Amino acid sequence: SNFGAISSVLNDILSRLDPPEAEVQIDRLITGRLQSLQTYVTQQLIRA
Amino acid sequence: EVFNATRFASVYAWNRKRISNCVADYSVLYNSASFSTFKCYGVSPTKL
Amino acid sequence: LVKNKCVNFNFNGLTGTGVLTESNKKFLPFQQFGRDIADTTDAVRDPQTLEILDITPCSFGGVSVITPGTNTSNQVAVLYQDVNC
Ligand SMILES: *[C@@H]1O[C@H](CO)[C@@H](O)[C@H](O)[C@H]1NC(C)=O
Ligand SMILES: *[C@@H]1O[C@H](CO)[C@@H](O)[C@H](O)[C@H]1NC(C)=O
Ligand SMILES: *[C@@H]1O[C@H](CO)[C@@H](O)[C@H](O)[C@H]1NC(C)=O
Ligand SMILES: *[C@@H]1O[C@H](CO)[C@@H](O)[C@H](O)[C@H]1NC(C)=O
Numbered sequence: 001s002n003f004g005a006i007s008s009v010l011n012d013i014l015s016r017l018d019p020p021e022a023e024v025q026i027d028r029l030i031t032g033r034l035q036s037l038q039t040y041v042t043q044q045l046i047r048a
Numbered sequence: 049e050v051f052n053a054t055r056f057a058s059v060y061a062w063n064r065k066r067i068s069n070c071v072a073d074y075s076v077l078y079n080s081a082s083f084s085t086f087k088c089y090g091v092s093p094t095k096l
Numbered sequence: 097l098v099k100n101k102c103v104n105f106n107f108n109g110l111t112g113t114g115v116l117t118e119s120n121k122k123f124l125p126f127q128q129f130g131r132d133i134a135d136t137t138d139a140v141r142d143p144q145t146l147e148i149l150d151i152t153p154c155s156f157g158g159v160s161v162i163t164p165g166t167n168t169s170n171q172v173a174v175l176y177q178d179v180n181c
Contacts, residue, residue, distance in 0.1 A: 009135070011112065018092045018095075021092070
């Protein structure tokens with residue numbers, strides 16, 4: 001998924017932007033992936 | 049041959065030029081202070 | 097070129113790391129990229145000698161500690177999860 005960033009690959013975006021400018025885009029990916037992981041953890045907790 | 053042209057066409061008859069199959073040194077573009085406005089959209093200047 | 101070792105590399109502007117090996121699958125004379133389900137590049141066409149190479153990440157590993165309790169004796173044992181000794 002893209003989650004609203006310019007690219008979905010961390011290395012590609014990290015290799016094409018100034019780090020002060022890049023710090024505003026990694027946060028979206030981090031938030032999206034964390035929110036994705038939490039749901040799976042909760043579902044496994046219920047199934048057990 | 050683009051930045052040193054003698055005469056520039058009108059804004060309603062702008063001309064486009066194609067660049068391919070060569071090597072580029074963009075340093076001279078961002079090293080000289082002659083330019084007044086120099087903006088990069090989507091990429092960093094140095095990383096070019 | 098150098099193979100058979102986990103190395104850092106970049107191809108035509110794309111960066112990456114891992115071990116690169118020769119490929120057996122047949123690549124079309126115009127394609128350049130090989131992608132998996134997770135959208136990660138794994139097949140690269142060399143732009144100088146025109147060969148196909150496959151990238152694989154090197155060993156992950158996993159470390160666990162078996163202990164009988166420091167209250168009795170200060171000794172431990174180590175367990176590697178997937179390392180093939
Ligand atoms: C035109 O070319 C000369 C040398 O080729 C260079 O010194 C000058 O900066 C160029 N003009 C520009 C980039 O506007
Ligand atoms: C260098 O260019 C020549 C083409 O004349 C060819 O050998 C190859 O495409 C390139 N690389 C090497 C290692 O020679
Ligand atoms: C430590 O081990 C000894 C030996 O069994 C035991 O008597 C003791 O309760 C343990 N804990 C402490 C705090 O000494
Ligand atoms: C583990 O290592 C042994 C000894 O080299 C080898 O025979 C065996 O095939 C290996 N197994 C795996 C799963 O790598």
